[PDB]
Design a protein around this ligand. Sequence first.
Ligand SMILES: *C(=O)N1C[C@H](NOS(=O)(=O)O)C=C(C)[C@H]1C(N)=O
Ligand SMILES: [Cl-]
Length: 267
Amino acid sequence: NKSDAAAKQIKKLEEDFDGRIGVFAIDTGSGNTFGYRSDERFPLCSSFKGFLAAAVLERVQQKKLDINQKVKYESRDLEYHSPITTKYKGSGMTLGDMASAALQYSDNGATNIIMERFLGGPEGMTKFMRSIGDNEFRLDRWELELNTAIPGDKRDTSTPKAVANSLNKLALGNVLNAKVKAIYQNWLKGNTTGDARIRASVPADWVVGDKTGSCGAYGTANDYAVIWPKNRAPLIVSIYTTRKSKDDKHSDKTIAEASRIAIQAID
Ligand SMILES: *C(=O)N1C[C@H](NOS(=O)(=O)O)C=C(C)[C@H]1C(N)=O
Ligand SMILES: [Cl-]
């Protein structure tokens, strides 16, 4: 019933903006799920940086990396949108700071430095995802080439369900031990780019940790969140959108609204 009505609303929403919305949402307290195009592929854009940070933490937990190790790059030409790395260029940053910059600010320099030195590049990032049983995820290119969002291109894509499940594994499951998962969770909660997406869809008193992506082509954008309501179990929401034309702007309000609908369906 509620599921049928939610489906109709997403559909109207995708027609209203001549685009494509994929949704997966889970109420971890009740088991309730909702999916719309949940097994279809969508560009990840910046949203994979949330997982890159999870990979970094797993490496620290396995003791291959130290969270306070210094990462120096004084002579590295930084990629476009390196707001955090560019201010620490002189002195370097700790591993954990760079990784949380990758997540919380979408820092492209942080991203590509981490993939280059600690994670084995895009194939290594893909391998990490495979290792938690995510068969859908792939990253193939570096920042910024990975953001082309060309329709019909499987490169740098995933599905909403796989995103949701993976997040549930990393933020809520036991890939990460209690102490390291707490940190990951805090990184998610302090994300600075998601105010007009999933966070906008929920009472202000609910706690959200999220990671957004905005390819800036084909109107492509997304957000995934763990959500802690008061006196209830966490929710997981995954929202992915594209648009028909290359020049199309992304719509924060469609994302926020698809989130409202996904949440109402599962609650
Ligand atoms: C990632 O997709 N980015 C980085 C930046 N952050 O906004 S986002 O977190 O919503 O993505 C902005 C972008 C337009 C995009 C990029 N530069 O690739
Ligand atoms: Cl590179």
